[PDB]
Design a binder for these strands. Structure first.
Ligand SMILES: Nc1ncnc2c1ncn2[C@@H]1O[C@H](COP(=O)(O)OP(=O)(O)O)[C@@H](O)[C@H]1O
Ligand SMILES: Nc1ncnc2c1ncn2[C@@H]1O[C@H](COP(=O)(O)OP(=O)(O)O)[C@@H](O)[C@H]1O
Ligand SMILES: Nc1ncnc2c1ncn2[C@@H]1O[C@H](COP(=O)(O)OP(=O)(O)O)[C@@H](O)[C@H]1O
Ligand code: BEF
Ligand code: BEF
Ligand code: BEF
Ligand SMILES: [Mg+2]
Ligand SMILES: [Mg+2]
Ligand SMILES: [Mg+2]
Ligand SMILES: [Zn+2]
Ligand SMILES: [Zn+2]
Ligand SMILES: [Zn+2]
Ligand SMILES: [Zn+2]
Lengths: 333, 27, 334, 362, 365, 359
DNA sequence: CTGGCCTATA
DNA sequence: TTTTTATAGGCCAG
């Protein structure tokens, strides 16, 4: 199973097409660009009939029996695409898949689009028997760290030249939304044939449109970066998230901080991180938080988080977003 | 803090008192 | 659902008015839980959907009661809350208000039993108003709550109230001593926790519950002297929280009662815990905490979907703060 | 054919309606002045004559005798309104039929002239329950109905209606019924029903009604049951959890004396006698009121209190005006928050506690 | 019959206040500068629906497009009677759905029957679904020559900003107490109806801005007063007691005189005045006083009969003192609900006053 | 109507928005043309006016040019409104799928008059789930002679799977001057009297939108019986003030009794729910208080109000602020119990202006 | 005219 | 790894 980054994929797809193309990931722009990189090289190799199917737990045993019947030779080459449920491959469809793994022609080309699978889902027999035939692409978006690199990489692919300065500015504005980033580049190459994208040029044709999860916000608080927190909030509101979701995800942390802070006196930092099975990457970030906030400041946070919840589900208050703008700030002193 | 001032607390009757007479009296 | 012996009188009197034909169409029984209101209702229900009654009793052998024994009597409506939920929705009241107009599907009277009017929504309560004031003929309503005053204004004036009062404690203890084997102290405490209703008493013993009060007690025994109350989170944070809080508040109050050398305390069974509470907590704090304990309880019970962990966790950190000297304590409002 | 008094006795002629004389006046007045509106909103608390009146106002507009203030009740029309069988008072249970589509049906069938009646009279009752959208739907029609249409709007809680709705109605707040008003009535009714009654028992009922004629008739009917045919001072008082005067005061006293052990134990004894806890608090609140009153002018202690007067006057002489206010409030508040506390008893016990430790100043 | 309806203005002349709206439309009509989307907003009863109708009526007057429609050509009279083929008044609160809006859209292209313009007056327009709002978008941005759109709503707050950028927005202002009064006079005069001067001053205050609210109160005032609009009748219906007694209680209170206070309460109790109400006139008075202290030109026009005395109070009593009485009576109101007895409750509240009285508290033991 | 007549026919006629024009200009110029473009941004800033322009420039008889002539049979045909090959769907009224499918059966047939069959789907966010799917299938295999122009105010509502098929231009909202200079021009042209500071007032009031602007101006002309005078413009805009809540906060701190008693009285005319006035103020103090904890707490949102807000944060003690808040937050909890609701706000503002709570 | 889906308001 | 609820109004494909 040739494991690829969407950038690298274009080259591996030209060398030789393979029976199974596995598009896994969370990013929409990597998914289309990779799915369209394949549909393009499929038609070129004599493929006309392009059949799409969206796989719910809804697709009957009648809708998977029209799919295995779908491939009979000799047909002018046809590309079958299969979309996924949120969960990935469930016991019901983890079996339907098996049925298809053996039906592999040069006449029928398999493409699959979905999230990332739990490791056990992954290692389910059928998947690993496809394995040597299949190419798999990682379409996980880049995070604040991995990103600028991918910007300058796609920048140099569009042969435009990006300043350290402009890269910084694109990445702030389109973080979490690669598609807007890409179209930003395209937009700039049309503004300037130069290819040269100054900080002052790029600054003028940008709009602010970053997509975050709530986890991006608690992390932001945890590290004390507040100008970030505030940005993340403002954005999360505009995508219209349920504040309740913010509340509950800050809580899962806030309350662990509280319990850790106390327990910290008695046992060493690391032991407690182990005790509570704290994700490894988080553990450094958590320390920082712990080291910064007083056992009282936490006590206040907890109190203020309760003020907003009640204000939310009993007083049906509007406040709620403001009440978080504040709570954010607090956890940064 | 008078005992009266205390009783007013217990009663919820909040005592208000000037602080900028300037913008009052003078029209 | 069980039938308890202190119901015979309350039943007989009620049935008598019905038997005259001069019964009231919207009864509202107010009773503590465990008090067995439901069985009084059931008994009166069986009486009404009886085509061949035998005095105060239901025969068993008429087409009416067979159906009633086997759940499905076409003219017997039960307004309880959906399985997963804890409120009692308007849509569900409106089906009953609608069906009620169709001439009785068996040609007997129709009885509608609202298990707990406390649980009606605002929309659901009002929905019930007009059908309740003047329902079709030969239709009989039964409603039960803990606290009528928590019940919609108008819904209330359409009802006849019947108070199912609990037996004398002496009787109750004697009942209990037969159903469980516990120390007279424990019974009387259990009974006293439960506002005097046996059975509701008995309950505590039956469920995992009683072991669980011993564990609140275990953990309190530590929190008090140590000033560590967030320790309690473990014993309080559970589905039955509003129930366990009530326990903790009764402990708090008994302490406060000792600071006044009062005669009855509620937790007769652990006068050690009651003491250590009177010893390491000033009355000022005993009472300020009793306060927030009760108040957070309300919210745990009245706010739909509110997060337990978050609320209880606040309450505990905040109590510790109260324990600090000179901190300002709460004083009720309006 | 038995129906609860609270039902049987529904006023069927303007004559047979209690108080609310300002409403009936304006009404009968309008009918007689020929000044009839198209939107009448009727408000007030539970069971004071809202829907009863609305239905009487309907009778009068439709009466075979003419449009009258004094509808007979003897024509095919009136008799059919009395029984709901009247085709031309479309009476809507707003709290049940609240949705827009529901009330847009209402609107479409407006334009249509009335069946066998003079006016087509809608009576949306429990109206505070119509969806937001349902209110707005009515706006355009409610303001400009067809001459043959009359809208009758009753609700307990007019607070909830859009001000756009209110701008389009005559509003009649019914006042709560005076205690006397309720009793005289109660008397009358039990007389006609041929039921025996003791006057002081009536007095207790009218009080417990707390302004409301339905509430009254409902407790009355309750009386009759737990009384075995009779409404006796004995039965009603035991039913309503009524106090024997001593008990309240004794508490009030043990409370200002700061006497914990005795306040608590006094309650315990009350709890045994099965007193209505809310009753106790009100009676103390009542006692605290005189006391603060007597301080003002000595004369202010009634002829009633003769038995107590001795104990009252001391309390008034000893305890500061100021400090009593605290006591009264703490108890009021506790009556407020009573039903919310775990037991009603506890609610009382916590209230006394909070108030207990007021005693030494500094 | 019904005043609210009978007096809906039939020409611009007859519209009360709103000069800023009438004045534009007339200026614009005579100027030949006419939009195709007019939006009307303001709280209930300030004239939007009736103004809009006047605009249609003036757009289609057979005499020509004039701000002074003639009210006698087939087109004007038939707009008056609401049966004019080309003024399509849509009750947006019942035609809220998209499909309904699309129908209004489809039938737009078609030319008017008898008028210069097909004018759609969409009333209570805030009720349109999101869907049927954008439905309106493009067609409202660029309609056909013969089409005009009159929208009107209580709150424009609810209309998508896209809708807003496409219209003239005219915000009718609520009415001065004076304005309402003057009209109430004119109408009761025209309708030949006895009226006490002050009974009008009272209604126009209770109208709280709305000329309809006022006509609605007058209608029922006439009925309450029996063909007369008398002060006693209006203040009966209003829960007002005529001002003296109220103030007299304030006075007695600031003057720390207990006897008088309780007497005055007893006397009000003989008149069976409803307790909460009393409390409220007292808060009303205290507040105006405390205000008079802020700006002096602040004291109300309506309370001439009491100004002498009020002014005095504002002059003699410390602000920090009035803040006392106000708050004391205010949490007194917060209490009345639960007090044993609403009388008792008011009384008790003033007794509380007396004991905390800033200047001559009640005597201690 | 000013809004209609002054719709830009030539690129030259368009205000600002340059980062969009130029890239179009150049792509046309330099033979780069995507099968489909998406134009977003706020009400009346160019979205559709530009979309139309791109059609002109795509089909101009002079060739595919950035500078359409606006005088050929094609440019005047489009400008007019009836051009054989300019299909402008009102996506908002025709959103059901039936209609989208029927629109795209005809997509395949060659263009009758001109270079490209140009579909201009405006207010496109309205199309159903299914209707989007239809479009999609056509965007994924775009006929050569066809170009798609999608214009919406709210793009977030298009499926990722369609935004990933359009080159999207986000139009910026217009600058205060940008609007003013355009307002001068147009009034000038129409032969209408204006003052300097009258227009400065309208451009501000537009809150960034050039349509709001001319729509405001149109009205202004009527208030002015033919003259757009400051005397008149200022009066009118006073008819439509959002103001009150902020405006009171300002006169609150300064301790201006008359200004307060007057605003309260202006707000009365607007016809406001009073409880809502307090809440806007309270919210207002909250925001400010926090601009006092980072410059960063002021919205992309804010802008119109924003200038005033920042100064207010700079020049009031943070301790003074929490104070004002208390006083308001309080007066709100008291509003039901104050005699009048108006009265309760009035009292609250006195409390806030001049008094201090001792506790 | 059903079941899937989105929204607003308290 | 992302969540309160009860009740309403509403669009849509087939
Ligand atoms: N003013 C009244 N006069 C006589 N009976 C009344 C009056 N108000 C209420 N009642 C009694 O209350 C019962 C219901 O009254 P109703 O008018 O329906 O109250 P509501 O205003 O709550 O709908 C009637 O049966 C009647 O006996
Ligand atoms: N500006 C006004 N001038 C005269 N009468 C008015 C005015 N505003 C409201 N009214 C009265 O109120 C009634 C309804 O007015 P209307 O314009 O429908 O209020 P709305 O703006 O809420 O629709 C009219 O019949 C008229 O008597
Ligand atoms: N950039 C601009 N230049 C000139 N006029 C503009 C501009 N943007 C908006 N307008 C004015 O607004 C009117 C409509 O603009 P339009 O482009 O339709 O906005 P939208 O993007 O919201 O569809 C135009 O006729 C023009 O008067
Ligand atoms: F019980 Be009533 F209709 F207020
Ligand atoms: F009565 Be209006 F149109 F608000
Ligand atoms: F026409 Be635009 F989107 F306001
Ligand atoms: Mg009723
Ligand atoms: Mg109107
Ligand atoms: Mg547009
Ligand atoms: Zn039987
Ligand atoms: Zn009759
Ligand atoms: Zn005319
Ligand atoms: Zn050209």
């Amino acid at each position: 199973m040739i494991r690829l980054y969407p950038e690298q994929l274009r080259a591996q797809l030209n060398e030789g097409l393979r029976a199974a193309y596995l598009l896994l990931g969370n990013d929409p722009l990597l998914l289309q660009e990779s799915q369209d990189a394949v549909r393009q090289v499929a038609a070129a190799q004599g493929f006309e009939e392009h059949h799409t199917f969206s796989i719910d737990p809804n697709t009957d045993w009648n809708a998977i029996f029209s799919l295995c019947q779908a491939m009979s030779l000799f047909a002018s080459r046809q590309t079958l695409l299969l979309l996924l449920p949120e969960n990935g491959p469930n016991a019901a469809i983890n079996e339907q898949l098996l049925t298809l793994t053996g039906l592999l022609h040069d006449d029928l080309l398999l493409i699959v689009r979905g999230n990332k699978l739990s490791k056990a889902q992954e290692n389910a027999a059928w998947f690993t028997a496809l394995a040597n035939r299949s190419v798999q692409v990682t379409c996980q978006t880049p995070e604040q760290a991995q990103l600028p690199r991918w910007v300058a990489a796609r920048a140099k692919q569009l042969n435009l030249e990006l300043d350290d300065a402009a890269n910084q500015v694109l990445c702030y504005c389109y973080e979490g939304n690669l598609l807007a980033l890409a179209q930003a580049l395209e937009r700039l190459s049309l503004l300037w044939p130069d290819g040269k994208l100054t900080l002052p040029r790029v600054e003028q044709a940008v709009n602010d449109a970053a997509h975050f999860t709530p986890f991006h916000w608690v992390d932001a608080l945890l590290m004390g970066k507040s100008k970030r927190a505030l940005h993340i909030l403002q954005q999360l509101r505009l995508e219209g998230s349920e504040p309740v979701i913010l509340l509950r995800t800050l809580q899962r942390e806030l309350l662990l901080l509280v319990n850790l802070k106390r327990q910290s006196a008695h046992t060493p930092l690391r032991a407690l991180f182990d005790k509570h099975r704290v994700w490894q990457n988080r553990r450094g970030m958590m320390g920082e938080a712990l080291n910064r906030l007083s056992q009282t400041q936490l006590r206040q946070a907890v109190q203020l988080l309760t003020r907003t919840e009640l204000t939310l589900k009993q007083d049906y208050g509007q406040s709620v977003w403001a009440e978080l703008e504040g709570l954010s700030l607090l956890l940064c002193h | 803090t008078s005992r009266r001032d205390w009783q007013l607390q217990q009663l919820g009757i909040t005592q208000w008192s000037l602080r900028r007479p300037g913008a009052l009296q003078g029209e | 659902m069980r039938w308890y012996p202190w119901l015979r009188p309350d039943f007989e009197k009620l049935v008598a008015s019905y038997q005259a034909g001069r019964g009231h169409h919207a009864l509202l029984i107010q009773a503590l839980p465990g008090m067995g209101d439901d069985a009084l209702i059931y008994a009166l229900s069986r009486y009404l959907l009886c085509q061949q009654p035998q005095g105060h009793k239901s025969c068993g052998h008429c087409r009416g009661c067979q159906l009633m024994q086997a759940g499905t009597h076409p003219d017997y409506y039960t307004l309880a809350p959906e399985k997963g939920k804890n409120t009692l929705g308007v849509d569900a009241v409106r089906e009953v208000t609608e069906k009620l107009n169709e001439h009785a599907r068996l040609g007997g009277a129709k009885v509608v039993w609202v298990t707990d009017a406390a649980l009606l929504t605002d929309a659901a309560a009002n929905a019930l108003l007009k059908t309740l004031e003047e329902p079709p003929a030969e239709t009989w309503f039964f409603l039960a709550t803990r606290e009528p005053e928590r019940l919609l204004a108008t819904l209330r004036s359409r009802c006849r109230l019947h108070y199912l009062a609990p037996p004398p404690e002496q009787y109750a203890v004697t009942w209990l001593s037969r159903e469980v084997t516990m120390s007279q102290d424990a019974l009387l405490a259990a009974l006293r926790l439960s506002a005097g209703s046996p059975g509701a008493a008995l309950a505590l013993f039956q469920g995992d519950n009683w072991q669980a009060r011993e564990t609140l007690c275990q953990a309190l025994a530590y929190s008090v002297p140590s000033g560590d109350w967030y320790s309690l989170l473990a014993a309080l944070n559970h589905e039955q929280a509003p129930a366990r809080l009530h326990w903790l508040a009764t402990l708090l109050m008994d302490a406060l009662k000792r600071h006044h050398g009062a005669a009855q305390v509620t937790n007769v069974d652990v006068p050690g815990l009651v003491a250590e509470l009177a010893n390491h907590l000033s009355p000022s704090r005993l009472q300020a905490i009793l306060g927030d304990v009760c108040h957070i309880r309300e919210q745990l019970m009245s706010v739909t979907g509110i997060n337990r962990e978050l609320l209880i966790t606040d309450l505990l950190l905040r109590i510790e703060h109260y324990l600090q000297p000179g901190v300002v304590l709460p004083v009720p409002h309006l | 054919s038995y129906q609860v008094l609270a039902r049987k006795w529904r006023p069927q002629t303007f004559a047979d309606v209690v108080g609310q004389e300002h409403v009936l006046t304006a009404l009968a007045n309008g009918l007689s002045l020929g000044r009839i509106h198209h939107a009448y909103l009727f408000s007030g608390t539970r069971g004071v004559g809202k829907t009863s009146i609305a239905r009487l106002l309907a009778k009068g507009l439709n009466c075979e005798t003419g449009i009258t203030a004094t509808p007979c009740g003897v024509c095919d029309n009136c008799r059919e309104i009395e029984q709901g069988r009247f085709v031309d008072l479309i009476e809507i249970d707003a709290a049940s039929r609240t949705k827009v589509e529901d009330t847009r049906d209402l609107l479409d069938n407006v334009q249509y002239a009335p069946a066998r009646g003079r006016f087509k009279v809608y009576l949306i009752d429990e109206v505070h329950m119509l969806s937001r959208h349902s209110f707005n739907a009515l706006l355009k029609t409610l303001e400009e109905p067809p001459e043959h249409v009359k809208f009758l709007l009753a609700t307990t809680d007019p607070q909830k209606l859009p001000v756009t709705i209110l701008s389009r109605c005559l509003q009649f707040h019914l006042k709560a019924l005076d205690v006397e008003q309720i009793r005289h009535q109660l008397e009358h009714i039990l007389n006609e029903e041929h039921i025996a009654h003791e006057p002081r028992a009536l007095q207790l009922l009218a009080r417990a009604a707390e302004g409301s004629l339905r509430d009254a008739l409902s407790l009355t009917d309750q009386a009759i049951a737990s009384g075995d045919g009779q409404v006796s001072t004995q039965a009603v008082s035991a039913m309503l959890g009524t106090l024997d005067d001593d008990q309240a005061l004794s508490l009030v006293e043990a409370m200002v004396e700061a006497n914990g052990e005795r306040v608590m134990a006094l309650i315990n004894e009350a709890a045994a006698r099965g007193i209505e806890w809310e009753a106790l608090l009100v009676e103390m609140l009542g006692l605290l009121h005189r006391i603060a009153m007597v301080q003002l002018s000595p004369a202010a202690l009634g002829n009633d209190m003769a038995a107590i007067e001795l104990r009252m006057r001391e309390l008034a002489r000893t305890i500061p005006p100021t400090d009593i206010q605290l006591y009264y409030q703490t108890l009021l508040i506790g009556r407020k928050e009573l039903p919310y506390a775990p037991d009603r008893r506890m609610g009382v016990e916590m209230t006394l506690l909070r108030a207990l430790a007021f005693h030494p100043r500094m």
